[PDB]
Amino acid sequence: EKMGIGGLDKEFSDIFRRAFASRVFPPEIVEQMGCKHVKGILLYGPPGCGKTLLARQIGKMLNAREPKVVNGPEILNKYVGESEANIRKLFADAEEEQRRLGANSGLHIIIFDEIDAICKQRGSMAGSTGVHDTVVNQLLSKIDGVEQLNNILVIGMTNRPDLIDEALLRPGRLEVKMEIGLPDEKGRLQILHIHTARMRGHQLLSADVDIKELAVETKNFSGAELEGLVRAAQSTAMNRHIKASTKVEVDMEKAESLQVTRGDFLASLENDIKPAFGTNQEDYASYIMNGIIKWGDPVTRVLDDGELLVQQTKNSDRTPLVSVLLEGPPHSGKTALAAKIAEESNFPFIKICSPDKMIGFSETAKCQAMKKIFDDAYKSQLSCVVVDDIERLLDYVPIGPRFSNLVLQALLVLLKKAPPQGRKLLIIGTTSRKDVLQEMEMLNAFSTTIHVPNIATGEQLLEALELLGNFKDKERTTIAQQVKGKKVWIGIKKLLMLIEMSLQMDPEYRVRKFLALLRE
Amino acid sequence: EKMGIGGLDKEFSDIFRRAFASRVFPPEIVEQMGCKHVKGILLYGPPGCGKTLLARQIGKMLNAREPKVVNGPEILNKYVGESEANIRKLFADAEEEQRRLGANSGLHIIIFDEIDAICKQRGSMAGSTGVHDTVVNQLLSKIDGVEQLNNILVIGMTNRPDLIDEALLRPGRLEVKMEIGLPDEKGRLQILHIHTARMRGHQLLSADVDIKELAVETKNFSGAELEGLVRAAQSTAMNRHIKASTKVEVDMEKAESLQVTRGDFLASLENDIKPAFGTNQEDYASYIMNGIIKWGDPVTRVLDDGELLVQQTKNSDRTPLVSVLLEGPPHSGKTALAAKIAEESNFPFIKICSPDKMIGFSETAKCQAMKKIFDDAYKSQLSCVVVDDIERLLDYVPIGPRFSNLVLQALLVLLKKAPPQGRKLLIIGTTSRKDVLQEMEMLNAFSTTIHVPNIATGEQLLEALELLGNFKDKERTTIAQQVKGKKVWIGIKKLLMLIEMSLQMDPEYRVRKFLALLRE
Amino acid sequence: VVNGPEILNKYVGESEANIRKLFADAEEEQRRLGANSGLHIIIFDEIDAICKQRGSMAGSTGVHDTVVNQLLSKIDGVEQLNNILVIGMTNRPDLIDEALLRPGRLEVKMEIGLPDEKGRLQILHIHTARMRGHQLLSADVDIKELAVETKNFS
Numbered sequence A, B: 001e002k003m004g005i006g007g008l009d010k011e012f013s014d015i016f017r018r019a020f021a022s023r024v025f026p027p028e029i030v031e032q033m034g035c036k037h038v039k040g041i042l043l044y045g046p047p048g049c050g051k052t053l054l055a056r057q058i059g060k061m062l063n064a065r066e067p068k069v070v071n072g073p074e075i076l077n078k079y080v081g082e083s084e085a086n087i088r089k090l091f092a093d094a095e096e097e098q099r100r101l102g103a104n105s106g107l108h109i110i111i112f113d114e115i116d117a118i119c120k121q122r123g124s125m126a127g128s129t130g131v132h133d134t135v136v137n138q139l140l141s142k143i144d145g146v147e148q149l150n151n152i153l154v155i156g157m158t159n160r161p162d163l164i165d166e167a168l169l170r171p172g173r174l175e176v177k178m179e180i181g182l183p184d185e186k187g188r189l190q191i192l193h194i195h196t197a198r199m200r201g202h203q204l205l206s207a208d209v210d211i212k213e214l215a216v217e218t219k220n221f222s223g224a225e226l227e228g229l230v231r232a233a234q235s236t237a238m239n240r241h242i243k244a245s246t247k248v249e250v251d252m253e254k255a256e257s258l259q260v261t262r263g264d265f266l267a268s269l270e271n272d273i274k275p276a277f278g279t280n281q282e283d284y285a286s287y288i289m290n291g292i293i294k295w296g297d298p299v300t301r302v303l304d305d306g307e308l309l310v311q312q313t314k315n316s317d318r319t320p321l322v323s324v325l326l327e328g329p330p331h332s333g334k335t336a337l338a339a340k341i342a343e344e345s346n347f348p349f350i351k352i353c354s355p356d357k358m359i360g361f362s363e364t365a366k367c368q369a370m371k372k373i374f375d376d377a378y379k380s381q382l383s384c385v386v387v388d389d390i391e392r393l394l395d396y397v398p399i400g401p402r403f404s405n406l407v408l409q410a411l412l413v414l415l416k417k418a419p420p421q422g423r424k425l426l427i428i429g430t431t432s433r434k435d436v437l438q439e440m441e442m443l444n445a446f447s448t449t450i451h452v453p454n455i456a457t458g459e460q461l462l463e464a465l466e467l468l469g470n471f472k473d474k475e476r477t478t479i480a481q482q483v484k485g486k487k488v489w490i491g492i493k494k495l496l497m498l499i500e501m502s503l504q505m506d507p508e509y510r511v512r513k514f515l516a517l518l519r520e
Numbered sequence C: 001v002v003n004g005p006e007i008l009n010k011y012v013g014e015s016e017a018n019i020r021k022l023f024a025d026a027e028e029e030q031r032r033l034g035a036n037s038g039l040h041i042i043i044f045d046e047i048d049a050i051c052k053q054r055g056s057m058a059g060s061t062g063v064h065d066t067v068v069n070q071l072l073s074k075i076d077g078v079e080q081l082n083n084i085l086v087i088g089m090t091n092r093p094d095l096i097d098e099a100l101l102r103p104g105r106l107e108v109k110m111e112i113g114l115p116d117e118k119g120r121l122q123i124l125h126i127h128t129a130r131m132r133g134h135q136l137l138s139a140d141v142d143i144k145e146l147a148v149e150t151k152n153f154s
């Protein structure tokens, strides 16, 4: 339509309505029904969603010919007297054109590129005691008394929503707050196409660049983050050409200037991996280090009961909140199977609330960083949160026994706190202690419990060793002469610890080392 | 008398007692018998509450005939000395009538627009030394020393009640409390009829539009949002007059002028959602999530004994404080039926002291969020407070057992502390652990307990399933023919867990899976 | 007259300077004539809030450890060797500092108890003497009779 803004179909049409459609188009109801038009728009959002790119381009749709972009703290850099002077010379050229020509253009655009630098009045009623609050209210006195019944438009944008005072967020001052969030899958295919427009019209690069395949593999990150995939991608194609021949500098147009491949993109999201946030992108290989093998027949019967219950989250309307529990012996593979079921849902918000990121926190800050994860799962539609390793969030120890009662009573409630209306949430829990959770009345809160047992037979013990591929078939036959006819019971995380302790010995001594360690 | 304004019907005597009631009758014995005057009224309220149309009338209460308006920020643009002389443009306006005639109604009230801008008083003196507070030390002299024989009333008005000056709280200065609430039903529809008369189109708008059709859906917010409600709707007319016609590039008068349809206000409360406020009931549907089916006689036993007790709260003399406790097994509908008894009571103040809004709070913050609820129940005449899930407020866990004593003592008092005379308070409690609340000496404090049991028979089980409507009669016969003459004992919330998990399965194995679930 | 809790309302720095401000206005009146007025009266409206010293060492990491100073060693050492008079008053009189009740500093008590019914008669005669300058308003309002149904208050 214009210089590209993608994934804001429901939002660029929203600022069509409130400011753009009135005061210019019809104009008969404007001149019949004497109207007050809106004064400007406040732009919420995480960094990287084109808040500037609207205001860089909203002064470039009707070609109003007067854009006025001021910077954030650009006013304040004078001393007293002249501090107030810049905003009353900023509105002045549009206030002067409120003339005997009172209507009819009508100088529109006034842009504060980050307005919370000036307009705080945050509620703690402080901060230099008002060199800014003499240009906060001087800004407010310029729009009401004297009235600007005009075409002016004060588009100020920000990142912190609440810290601008609501006396400036009243409808006479500024009403239209607009949450400009990170785009979805449909939003990201709109926005890969813009930066890959000129390269699409460059040489038909390699035809394996599928922006639908790049929409799904890039699942979280926003617009400016998504441009940074491209600026590394076409830069990767340069050092495909400018350093393979010579060093700094020599080579210049030696290979008939080359093409952006799919192999450049997949290396461009190995570097950079980081979406920033990192919501749904933890790179959970730290939680699943050695894959998910089907060592036992119950293993499929664990992770199907996940997706037999994931469909309850996707489809239902009776039960909007699902709280499952993956229990069992320790080292049995509960955290690993919790990440796989959380991955196979393909939800748009998959967060692993896990105590490996919460160490050293006091009894209180574990409640806040569990509140924060269970806030950002309410701000979606489908979301799975793995409340991992219950007896570490509860920081339990069986001497006494002691545990944080502040966290437990912030965790018995979040298993029953439903999300807002129409929204869904899946809670996967892992514990090695069912009987401890039976005392604290948490099995009452969890909906159903999935048992993850250890290995049960020697036939499961051989099959657990088959798929890993660490012993020879004659060595497995020696184990089959041993572990068949015996009772074995050991976890799978421990069973990876045993094999790596056994492979460090001499080849005549590895099997007898493994039989000693398995004996416990 | 009054200009169509109400809400504070107990306050319309207060102006006719102390402040406005004096300075008329002798007026030359006021100095012979030293009745000290009052110099000002201070007005509280939210942003957009509307005070000026009352402030021009509060001088017309006295027939003042010179209410002049000084603004908050507009006096604060000029420098020091000049600003203190421009307040002497409007205080020596009333001091020239402090003439050799020292009586007979010297010149009248000066209107403020914003004491939030003028009076701040942090105690800061770091950067323009608080130039906002440098006009008031001259302006506190203009009311006292040198005092006035005028009948002025300094009408202080703010949108934030914190930064009214605590050094101005002197009985000779402005000293009396005056909260002004939201506009009521008649106050909102008349000002809707003010705006729709000028924005008429034909009469008010196009058809299917009425100010009471809006009053039955817009009953929440303040006045400035209500001007922005129509201002969004005449912009939703620009959704209709031009955007429902075609795109940006609309023609000249071919839509037949196509003004506001129904809704254009339903959308204005949903895209975007504009309550901004604060404070109304939210949400008795968030706790009654799947409705209240009536699976037999124990559902009836809850509702009749509740409302006979609601008749006790409304129509008593001996019992100003009625405290009832609901009980039973967990997952048995205790939270919902307490909300059902309160919502049918039609009391004005029905708020829910709930644990799921207090997660992560300390022991002190659970006692000040509970007093803040019970203080606002001491202000209305009839009020029912649902105090849900006592043992999560008491953050109880039966290991040790550890519970916050400080909440228990902020709760054992409030089940015995009556409100002041004429105002009644109903308190409903829910608990899963009945006898634990007995051991804390709290069934001592409740007046009565109304039992909420589980479902008992298959006839009551199927009645809970006939009202939900989820199964085929051949399956419902099979569900009947298994538990026919057998005993089942499970909660109703758990019944929603088992049935919804059974819906996800394949119909060859749905009922047999449900028959394995109902076994426990 | 300076208020009690008004002297503390700042951060660190000004609540030690305000207790010098109300003496430097007296110290600058110690002019070339060292005696002879001698700017006398300093009213603490509540000295209890300054020399609080409750033991819990709270209150802005011990601001009540740092605002006793210009009450202690500004009147004494170096002395304003005058006839000045720091007239303090309080409502929680036991928890004032022991270093303040020294014969160089504020040294002697004044127990103003709540008044007797003779003393309540004397104060009612004062604020009805202006009522007597109206018309006396009843010809039977007797302040001795009104002093019967006030037994305790001030």
Ligand SMILES: Nc1ncnc2c1ncn2[C@@H]1O[C@H](COP(=O)(O)OP(=O)(O)OP(=O)(O)O)[C@@H](O)[C@H]1O
Pocket: A004, A005, A006, A046, A047, A048, A049, A050, A051, A052, A053, A054, A113, A114, A157, A158, A159, A191, A194, A223, A224, A227
């Ligand atoms: N939705 C988008 N579509 C295309 N490009 C974008 C988009 N969002 C950001 N960009 C890129 O990012 C740059 C500006 O980003 P953006 O406006 O999001 O930063 P910002 O939000 O103004 O920063 P801040 O949050 O500090 O205000 C543009 O030059 C553009 O190349």
Ligand SMILES: Nc1ncnc2c1ncn2[C@@H]1O[C@H](COP(=O)(O)OP(=O)(O)OP(=O)(O)O)[C@@H](O)[C@H]1O
Pocket: A287, A288, A289, A290, A291, A292, A293, A294, A295, A299, A329, A330, A331, A332, A333, A334, A335, A336, A337, A389, A432, A492, A493
């Ligand atoms: N089929 C499998 N099922 C489960 N885990 C597996 C499987 N195959 C490999 N693993 C390994 O299990 C490891 C993680 O196990 P997990 O972290 O659940 O143990 P845990 O029960 O959390 O330990 P603890 O009881 O000490 O908390 C992963 O590193 C993964 O490599």
Ligand SMILES: Nc1ncnc2c1ncn2[C@@H]1O[C@H](COP(=O)(O)OP(=O)(O)OP(=O)(O)O)[C@@H](O)[C@H]1O
Pocket: B005, B006, B007, B008, B048, B049, B050, B051, B052, B053, B054, B055, B181, B182, B183, B184, B187, B188, B191, B223, B224
């Ligand atoms: N429930 C109510 N109780 C008392 N007064 C009410 C109520 N509802 C409305 N009012 C009156 O409505 C008026 C609001 O009028 P309006 O919004 O048109 O202008 P305003 O906001 O007062 O003016 P300004 O914008 O200058 O403050 C108030 O002054 C108030 O007196």
Ligand SMILES: Nc1ncnc2c1ncn2[C@@H]1O[C@H](COP(=O)(O)OP(=O)(O)OP(=O)(O)O)[C@@H](O)[C@H]1O
Pocket: A416, B287, B288, B289, B290, B291, B292, B293, B294, B295, B299, B329, B330, B331, B332, B333, B334, B335, B336, B337, B389, B432, B491, B492, B493, B496
């Ligand atoms: N007859 C009924 N009475 C009350 N609630 C019912 C009934 N039938 C179904 N329900 C449903 O049961 C659901 C759970 O109700 P509720 O939260 O009151 O259970 P609860 O026993 O109080 O749980 P908890 O004790 O853990 O708070 C509600 O969504 C409600 O719609």
